[PDB]
Design a protein around this nucleic acid. Structure first.
Ligand SMILES: [Mg+2]
Lengths: 219, 200
DNA sequence: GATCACAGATGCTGA
DNA sequence: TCAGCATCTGTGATC
């Protein structure tokens, strides 16, 4: 339903991912690819889409590490839309028979925290899926769809949001609202019980908690 | 014991037999659309990889996607086989793009399985499956929050709070003040203040 | 036609 | 994706 094509295709790569064949492929499809340290995940696609890239075997490996679902729930807490892209065959040779595990995980990542899975065949596939997501999610809409003014994509904003999210009571939406209000973390970290409760979604109780955290001296 | 309703016309599929033999109660119903009804909320659509592709290029896939999405809260399309069948090497851009569009514009969820075994494993999983961290002492929330800054460990978070005794105090300290803390140099300090001070 | 208090709907966080 | 519950809101009783 969203109609209009958006701006210059742009995404941020986390540094740990920078190494991939993926970024060069991405640039080769005309996507601007900016390598930065992101709080989480490997590709920042739009303000509310994070992408975590995993080879089918790292998918497997981290399922049994315990790594997978910790990472999973973090991503799902902080971004409104999480894509895990699995690159290569869903079940690698080395992992046959353990398939009941793998597919079960997939079904759980999907139902438990609403994460979204794409399976790609190679880097180029991942690079295509990322590029399409980038394009699709930009796009401002047509019939009866308001267009809002949208914050420019940045890593610095992402961390500003990651830092706000770490507070009790402060989640995805509120962190955003806190930024539009105060314009700055430091202006926010400086306001009063009163002013922090002005925010849609925060009450006296959560405001008190926040203030008390900001101010209580450390023994 | 998970129940799943299988549509009559899916019943030629190899999948349901495997389902049966994993303890899933396979019941045939006459489905309004879809291949397996996993709950009232959750419908599954099973397509072979080159069926997915064939129907991408017919324009049936997106028509089907439409009805699935309108008539059910959650929609899965399980695509059995490699995402890009040989017949379609060279149109992959078109395939993945459709996968992107299915998820962002229709909200539809995809799985990719390697064969009927996987598809049945996935279905069974869903059938069953729908059947810090921090806790409030202020001192601890403090060490948590600081530790979500780039580069900052627990030991550095400690030392930060030793020097400045308060977050509010740290959050307003000078680049020079901050970068002197042990385990925060110029590099990490620059980022911190950039984070602290960059406007919307 | 305005306030208000409060009970229950909304919409969030946190996973 | 969704439980659990904080925050918000619509309602209707009163002035
Ligand atoms: Mg990764």
């Amino acid at each position: 339903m969203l109609e209009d094509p958006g701006g210059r295709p742009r995404v941020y790569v986390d540094v740990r991912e920078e190494r991939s064949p993926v970024p060069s492929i991405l640039e080769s499809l005309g996507v601007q690819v900016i390598p930065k340290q992101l709080p989480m995940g490997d590709y920042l696609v739009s303000d509310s889409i994070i992408v975590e890239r995993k080879t089918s075997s790292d998918f497997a490996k981290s399922l049994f590490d315990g790594r997978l679902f910790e990472q999973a729930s973090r991503l799902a807490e902080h971004y409104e839309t999480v894509f895990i892209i699995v690159e290569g065959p869903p079940v690698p040779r080395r992992y046959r028979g353990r398939e009941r595990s793998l597919y079960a995980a997939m079904a759980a990542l999907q139902l438990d925290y609403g994460i979204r899975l794409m399976n790609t065949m190679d880097p180029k596939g991942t690079a295509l899926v990322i590029e399409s997501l980038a394009r699709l999610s930009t796009r401002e809409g047509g019939q009866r769809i308001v267009i809002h003014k949208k914050p420019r994509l940045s890593d610095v904003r992402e961390w500003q949001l990651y830092i706000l999210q770490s507070f009790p009571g402060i989640g995805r939406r509120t962190a955003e609202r806190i930024l539009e209000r105060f314009g700055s973390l430091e202006r926010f970290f400086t306001a009063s019980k009163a002013e922090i409760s002005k925010v849609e979604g925060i009450g006296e109780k959560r405001a008190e908690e926040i203030k008390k955290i900001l101010m209580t001296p450390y023994k």
